[PDB]
Amino acid sequence: ALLEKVDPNKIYTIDEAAHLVKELATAKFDETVEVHAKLGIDPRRSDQNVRGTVSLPHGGRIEFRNDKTGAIHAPVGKASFPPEKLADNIRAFIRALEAHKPEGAKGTFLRSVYVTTTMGPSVRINPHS
Length: 129
Description:
CATH topology of the domain at 1-26 and 76-105: Arc Repressor Mutant, subunit A
Largest sheet: 5 strands, mixed
Order of helices and strands: EHEEEEHEE
CATH architecture of the domain at 1-26 and 76-105: Helix non-globular
GO molecular function: rRNA binding; structural constituent of ribosome; tRNA binding
Keywords: Repressor, Ribonucleoprotein, Ribosomal protein, RNA-binding, rRNA-binding, Translation regulation, tRNA-binding
CATH superfamily of the domain at 1-26 and 76-105: 50S ribosomal protein L1, Chain A, Domain 1
Shape: globular
GO cellular component, one term: large ribosomal subunit
Oligomer: monomer
Organism: Thermus thermophilus
Radius of gyration: 15 Å
CATH class of the domain at 1-26 and 76-105: Special
Family: Belongs to the universal ribosomal protein uL1 family.
C-alpha cells in the first residue's frame, strides 16, 4: 500500500522524496511530478506577488506564479525520470523561488513545500536539503 510508505507527519529531504515518488506512481501511463509551495505572503496584498520563470536542468518549459492562496505549483519532470534527475529539478525550482521573496513580506518565505504525482499521498519536503 502507498499510504503506509508515506508518513504524513514526517518531512523528507529532496533526495528521499525523489526516490519515494517513484514507488507512489503506479499508473501504466507516465505521471507528472509536481512541486507545491505555500509562500509566506498574503494573497490579500498585491505587492507580494511572486511570478518568475526558471529553466529546469532536466526539462525546460516552466514559469511559476502564486495562486489565490499564496501557493506555488510547478511540474518538475516525470515519475519515469531517474531519481537523481527529479532531485535536481526540485532544488532548481526552490533555489529560484527563494530569490523572489518580495521586499514587502515579513516572516519565513517557504512555509510548506511538498511533491505529488497525479494521484496519491503528498510528500512533504525540507527545502533546505
